[PDB]
């Protein structure tokens, strides 16, 4: 009942970590199930300081990416529901929470848990009739309320993890080869850098302001313009210095003649831009902002530059699907990637969890797709997900806000790419089109009820996603309904853009994890089960749709193959739809068109891949056939530009991290994504370990770089902004600029980390150097201007010869620190270093004083 409730919302709980490697320590995960015998160990424990919990009419629910295998304390058991929702129920042996006392439930988990960020928020309890409560000390962003802090080695994945830990003192060892530069090295510095560029010694004067010639850009982008001059104080005036701009596409020949080319000249008594188009007075614009500096003083260097992108398709994708980010935050996503010229905006709008785009005539997708509440019959609601409690949330744009958007990106010379992913990460709008045919066939209208639905219901696999649903993640790719409501969205999409005045050029069909990973290489059957494996019972697994009698009859009449070949053959029927709404260009996660024999078998003359094949496990050869069998390779490596996964390997930061432990704004700027097996001479692998890369095959060259935002635990839009700033700064420069330590690709190379001296790390480190100092001393105050709450980096320091030395790895940011436990904090001056004694804490400050890092302990 609610009491009972009410008494379980009152319990407070703690999560400690026991052990990372328990199948080191005699724990036989293998026979739990655990992929590739690997589990942890992890103590739950629930305080009461109420009376006596003597009911047993309940269920407690929680959260988690990894599957729990095992439970401790016989009073209790855990099941999964679906997704991360698993639940905690009392056992015939329950004997109550105690009055005063504290419950241990000790649990194995599958994997391992290397960050506090990996334990989620917001569990709570139900009882038969009552309204669903948290257990309140666990409402919060802050895991320090219930997790507690990890300790010695627990934040290895294995006893040969090669990883560093960084604290304050092996983190100013890491940042120990950078140093702040004067800023008379910084002058003239342009970023991206510009392919060409000569620095004079005068200087332009734009304190009293700049008259600005917009009138080669449509009044939408010369406001962008206007307004950004103005946010970095100068203001716009018409006796101020004169910038000039024309568009010359004649002027451009070659390699140079394409979108976003200009010329610039910056001159003591007035400024020039000359484009191939509007994007490159836009552009060149762009660059006249990049030096007008963070400290008052109004000068620019006088410069001759001449520039083009190295690639056309610099991209930046987002997730609103597993978590909600408002438009505001799209918005201010948006005035950043102009400002450091990326043009491409890749929008997730749907997923497993969500569905974020308002489409005339099918209400249920937003209705029900677009939000998550304790609602078992996900008739209102889709079951909730990841930490958000059990009370309605989601949201969606509606129609306009959607317009709005691509006005916004239209003016920033931005183009916005809808994806709508399918086959598999499709539970939002398989479970709404489900929730309308129930609906519809109440109102006896059966013909309009099977119009849209997505599931057949013959349909009886047993089959789990990679985030462990089962077959209702799975739109069936051969219903004729499914082809319908793929049309539909389409060309309502299509129908949004067309008024918002950017027709759609690339349709994103998706097409990741279409498999069922029971049938994976780390589990094995419990009939002959190979030492070292997952032991589950793997005769009654299926391959998506395995069960569907449509697709079996669509098997039969020779349509297709196999099974296996669904999700491409789907892509193939989609490219189709694309093409019929007068879309040209198709882009796909590249698993789902493995199947296919070449980019000749889509309708659209150019197929676009996302390659998020990992590089260290063999994506530094497999890429090769990519752009060999026609596709456009974008170039999306999860070890380098997936901004989910953390900035450093410490346990008490953000992310996931299944493609690499961490991922820093140095790390970023050194991938060479043109040059694939380069890599392993200037990273490690997510082990730490060198690696070793070649490829025998001709590579043609990539067509883009996108670094991908998805949102599992960026429940927030500070969250978000956390993860993609600064570092896709990093992202921008190495999209528009090749530098000159990534070589060209050799066939037969071999690179082989550690070992191997190819590469010119020397440059590279000048180049950072640099750069990261660019970041610290100009850039960062910018972002600040713009609203952005990027991740200010925590100081290295040491104590040595009695005063504290401190560093940061973007110089010229300060830093602070604390002798009296973090209650006082004083100002760290390089040239006159303090004098210190026990224990010191530091932290860094953004450069209009208003934000601080985490501050650690020396
Ligand atoms: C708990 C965990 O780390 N799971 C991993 C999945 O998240 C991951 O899926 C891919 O990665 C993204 C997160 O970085 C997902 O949001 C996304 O849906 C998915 N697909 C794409 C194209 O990245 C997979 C990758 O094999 O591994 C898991 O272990």
Redesign the pocket.
């Given at each position: 009942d609610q009491q009972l409730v009410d008494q379980l919302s009152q319990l407070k709980l703690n999560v400690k970590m026991l052990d990372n490697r328990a199948g080191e320590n005699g724990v036989d995960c293998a026979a739990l199930g655990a992929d590739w015998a690997s589990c942890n160990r992890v103590l739950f424990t629930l305080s009461n300081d109420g009376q006596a919990i003597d009911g047993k009419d309940w269920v407690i629910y929680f959260h988690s990416?990894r599957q729990t295998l095992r439970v401790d304390n016989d009073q209790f058991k855990i099941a999964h529901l679906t997704g991360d929702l698993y639940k905690l129920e009392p056992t015939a042996k329950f004997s109550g929470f105690p009055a005063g006392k504290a419950v241990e439930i000790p649990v194995v988990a599958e994997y391992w848990q290397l960050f506090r960020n990996d334990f989620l928020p917001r569990w709570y309890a139900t009882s038969g009739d009552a309204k669903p409560k948290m257990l309140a000390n666990t409402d919060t962003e802050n895991l320090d309320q219930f997790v507690a802090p990890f300790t010695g080695d627990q934040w290895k994945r294995t006893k040969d993890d090669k990883n560093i830990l960084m604290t304050p003192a092996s983190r100013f060892v890491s940042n120990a080869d950078l140093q702040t530069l004067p800023a008379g090295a910084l002058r003239g510095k342009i970023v991206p850098t510009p392919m060409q560029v000569k620095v004079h010694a005068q200087d332009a004067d734009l304190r009293k302001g700049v008259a600005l010639d917009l009138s080669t850009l449509v009044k939408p982008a010369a406001d962008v313009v206007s307004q950004r001059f103005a946010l970095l104080g100068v203001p716009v005036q018409t006796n101020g210095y004169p910038i000039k701009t024309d568009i010359q596409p004649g002027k451009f020949k070659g390699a140079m003649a394409v979108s976003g080319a200009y010329e610039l000249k910056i001159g003591k008594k007035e400024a020039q831009v000359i484009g191939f188009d509007q994007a490159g007075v836009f552009y060149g614009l762009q660059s006249i902002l990049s030096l007008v500096p963070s400290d008052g003083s109004g000068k620019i260097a006088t410069l001759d530059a001449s520039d083009a992108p190295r690639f056309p398709y610099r991209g930046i994708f987002l997730?609103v699907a597993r978590n909600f980010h408002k438009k505001d935050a799209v918005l201010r996503l948006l005035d950043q990637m102009a400002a450091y010229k990326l043009n491409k905006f890749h929008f997730h709008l749907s997923?497993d969890e969500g569905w974020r785009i308002e489409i005339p005539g099918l209400p249920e997708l937003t209705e029900v797709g677009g939000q998550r509440c304790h609602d078992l019959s996900e008739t209102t609601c889709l079951l909730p997900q990841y930490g958000q409690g059990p009370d309605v949330y989601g949201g969606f744009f509606s129609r306009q806000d959607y317009i709005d958007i691509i006005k916004y990106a239209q003016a920033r010379q931005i183009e916005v790419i809808p994806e709508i992913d399918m086959p598999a990460?499709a539970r939002a709008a398989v479970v709404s089109m489900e929730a309308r045919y129930k609906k519809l066939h109440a109102a006896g209208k059966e013909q309009e009820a099977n119009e849209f639905r997505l599931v057949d219901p013959t349909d009886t696999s047993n089959t789990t996603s990679?985030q462990f649903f089962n077959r209702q993640s799975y739109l069936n790719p051969c219903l004729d309904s499914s082809q319908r409501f793929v049309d539909k969205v389409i060309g309502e999409i299509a129908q949004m853009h067309k008024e918002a005045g950017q027709p759609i050029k690339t349709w994103h069909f998706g097409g990741?994890?279409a498999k069922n990973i029971r049938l994976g290489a780390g589990y094995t059957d419990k009939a002959k089960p190979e030492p070292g494996k997952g032991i589950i019972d793997q005769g009654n697994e299926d391959k998506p749709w395995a069960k569907s009698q449509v697709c079996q009859t669509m098997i039969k009449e020779g349509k297709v193959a196999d099974m296996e070949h669904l999700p491409s053959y789907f892509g193939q029927e989609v490219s189709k739809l694309v093409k019929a709404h007068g879309i040209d260009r198709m882009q796909a996660?590249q698993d789902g068109l493995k199947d296919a024999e070449s980019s000749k078998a889509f309708a659209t003359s150019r197929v676009g891949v996302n390659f998020?094949d990992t590089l260290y496990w063999g994506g530094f050869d497999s890429v090769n056939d990519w752009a060999n069998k026609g596709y456009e390779v974008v170039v999306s490596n999860?070890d380098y530009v997936?901004m989910?996964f953390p900035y450093e390997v410490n346990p008490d930061e953000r992310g996931?991290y299944?493609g690499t432990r961490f991922s820093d704004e140095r790390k970023v700027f050194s991938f060479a994504p043109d040059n694939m097996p380069q890599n392993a001479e200037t990273s490690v692998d997510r082990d730490g370990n060198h690696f070793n890369a070649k490829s025998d095959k001709p590579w043609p060259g990539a067509y883009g770089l996108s670094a991908q935002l998805?949102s599992?635990t960026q429940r927030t839009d500070p969250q978000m902004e956390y993860m993609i700033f600064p570092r896709a700064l990093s992202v921008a420069e190495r999209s528009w600029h090749r530098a000159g330590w990534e070589q060209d690709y050799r066939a037969g190379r071999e690179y082989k980390g550690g070992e191997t001296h190819f590469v010119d790390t020397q440059a590279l480190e000048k180049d950072w150097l640099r750069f990261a100092n660019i970041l610290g001393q100009r850039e960062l105050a910018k972002l600040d201007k713009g609203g952005v709450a990027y991740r200010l980096p925590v100081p290295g320091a040491r104590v040595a010869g009695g005063k504290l030395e401190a560093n940061i790895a973007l110089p010229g940011l300060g830093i602070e620190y604390s002798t009296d436990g973090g209650k006082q904090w004083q100002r760290y001056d390089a040239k006159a270093k303090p004098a210190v004694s026990g224990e010191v804490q530091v932290r860094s400050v953004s450069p209009d004083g208003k934000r601080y890092s985490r501050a650690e302990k020396v």
């Amino acid at each position: 009942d609610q009491q009972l409730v009410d008494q379980l919302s009152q319990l407070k709980l703690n999560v400690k970590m026991l052990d990372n490697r328990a199948g080191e320590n005699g724990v036989d995960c293998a026979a739990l199930g655990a992929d590739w015998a690997s589990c942890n160990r992890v103590l739950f424990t629930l305080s009461n300081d109420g009376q006596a919990i003597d009911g047993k009419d309940w269920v407690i629910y929680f959260h988690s990416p990894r599957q729990t295998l095992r439970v401790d304390n016989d009073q209790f058991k855990i099941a999964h529901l679906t997704g991360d929702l698993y639940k905690l129920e009392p056992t015939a042996k329950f004997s109550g929470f105690p009055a005063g006392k504290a419950v241990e439930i000790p649990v194995v988990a599958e994997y391992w848990q290397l960050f506090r960020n990996d334990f989620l928020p917001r569990w709570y309890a139900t009882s038969g009739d009552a309204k669903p409560k948290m257990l309140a000390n666990t409402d919060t962003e802050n895991l320090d309320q219930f997790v507690a802090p990890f300790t010695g080695d627990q934040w290895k994945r294995t006893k040969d993890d090669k990883n560093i830990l960084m604290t304050p003192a092996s983190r100013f060892v890491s940042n120990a080869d950078l140093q702040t530069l004067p800023a008379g090295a910084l002058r003239g510095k342009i970023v991206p850098t510009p392919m060409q560029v000569k620095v004079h010694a005068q200087d332009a004067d734009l304190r009293k302001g700049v008259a600005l010639d917009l009138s080669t850009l449509v009044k939408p982008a010369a406001d962008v313009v206007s307004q950004r001059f103005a946010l970095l104080g100068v203001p716009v005036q018409t006796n101020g210095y004169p910038i000039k701009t024309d568009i010359q596409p004649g002027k451009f020949k070659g390699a140079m003649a394409v979108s976003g080319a200009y010329e610039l000249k910056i001159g003591k008594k007035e400024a020039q831009v000359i484009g191939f188009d509007q994007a490159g007075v836009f552009y060149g614009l762009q660059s006249i902002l990049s030096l007008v500096p963070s400290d008052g003083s109004g000068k620019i260097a006088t410069l001759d530059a001449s520039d083009a992108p190295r690639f056309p398709y610099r991209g930046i994708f987002l997730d609103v699907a597993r978590n909600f980010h408002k438009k505001d935050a799209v918005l201010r996503l948006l005035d950043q990637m102009a400002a450091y010229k990326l043009n491409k905006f890749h929008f997730h709008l749907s997923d497993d969890e969500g569905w974020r785009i308002e489409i005339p005539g099918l209400p249920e997708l937003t209705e029900v797709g677009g939000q998550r509440c304790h609602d078992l019959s996900e008739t209102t609601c889709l079951l909730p997900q990841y930490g958000q409690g059990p009370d309605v949330y989601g949201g969606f744009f509606s129609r306009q806000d959607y317009i709005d958007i691509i006005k916004y990106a239209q003016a920033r010379q931005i183009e916005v790419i809808p994806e709508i992913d399918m086959p598999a990460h499709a539970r939002a709008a398989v479970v709404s089109m489900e929730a309308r045919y129930k609906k519809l066939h109440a109102a006896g209208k059966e013909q309009e009820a099977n119009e849209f639905r997505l599931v057949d219901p013959t349909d009886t696999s047993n089959t789990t996603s990679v985030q462990f649903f089962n077959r209702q993640s799975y739109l069936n790719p051969c219903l004729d309904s499914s082809q319908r409501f793929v049309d539909k969205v389409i060309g309502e999409i299509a129908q949004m853009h067309k008024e918002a005045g950017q027709p759609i050029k690339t349709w994103h069909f998706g097409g990741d994890e279409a498999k069922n990973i029971r049938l994976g290489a780390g589990y094995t059957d419990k009939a002959k089960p190979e030492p070292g494996k997952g032991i589950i019972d793997q005769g009654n697994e299926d391959k998506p749709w395995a069960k569907s009698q449509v697709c079996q009859t669509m098997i039969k009449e020779g349509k297709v193959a196999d099974m296996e070949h669904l999700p491409s053959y789907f892509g193939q029927e989609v490219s189709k739809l694309v093409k019929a709404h007068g879309i040209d260009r198709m882009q796909a996660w590249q698993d789902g068109l493995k199947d296919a024999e070449s980019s000749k078998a889509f309708a659209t003359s150019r197929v676009g891949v996302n390659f998020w094949d990992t590089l260290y496990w063999g994506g530094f050869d497999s890429v090769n056939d990519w752009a060999n069998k026609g596709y456009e390779v974008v170039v999306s490596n999860p070890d380098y530009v997936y901004m989910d996964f953390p900035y450093e390997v410490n346990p008490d930061e953000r992310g996931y991290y299944w493609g690499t432990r961490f991922s820093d704004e140095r790390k970023v700027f050194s991938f060479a994504p043109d040059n694939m097996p380069q890599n392993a001479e200037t990273s490690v692998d997510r082990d730490g370990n060198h690696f070793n890369a070649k490829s025998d095959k001709p590579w043609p060259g990539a067509y883009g770089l996108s670094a991908q935002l998805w949102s599992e635990t960026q429940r927030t839009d500070p969250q978000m902004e956390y993860m993609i700033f600064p570092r896709a700064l990093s992202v921008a420069e190495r999209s528009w600029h090749r530098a000159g330590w990534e070589q060209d690709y050799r066939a037969g190379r071999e690179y082989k980390g550690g070992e191997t001296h190819f590469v010119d790390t020397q440059a590279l480190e000048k180049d950072w150097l640099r750069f990261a100092n660019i970041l610290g001393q100009r850039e960062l105050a910018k972002l600040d201007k713009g609203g952005v709450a990027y991740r200010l980096p925590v100081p290295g320091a040491r104590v040595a010869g009695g005063k504290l030395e401190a560093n940061i790895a973007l110089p010229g940011l300060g830093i602070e620190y604390s002798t009296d436990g973090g209650k006082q904090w004083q100002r760290y001056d390089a040239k006159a270093k303090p004098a210190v004694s026990g224990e010191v804490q530091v932290r860094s400050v953004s450069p209009d004083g208003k934000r601080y890092s985490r501050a650690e302990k020396v």
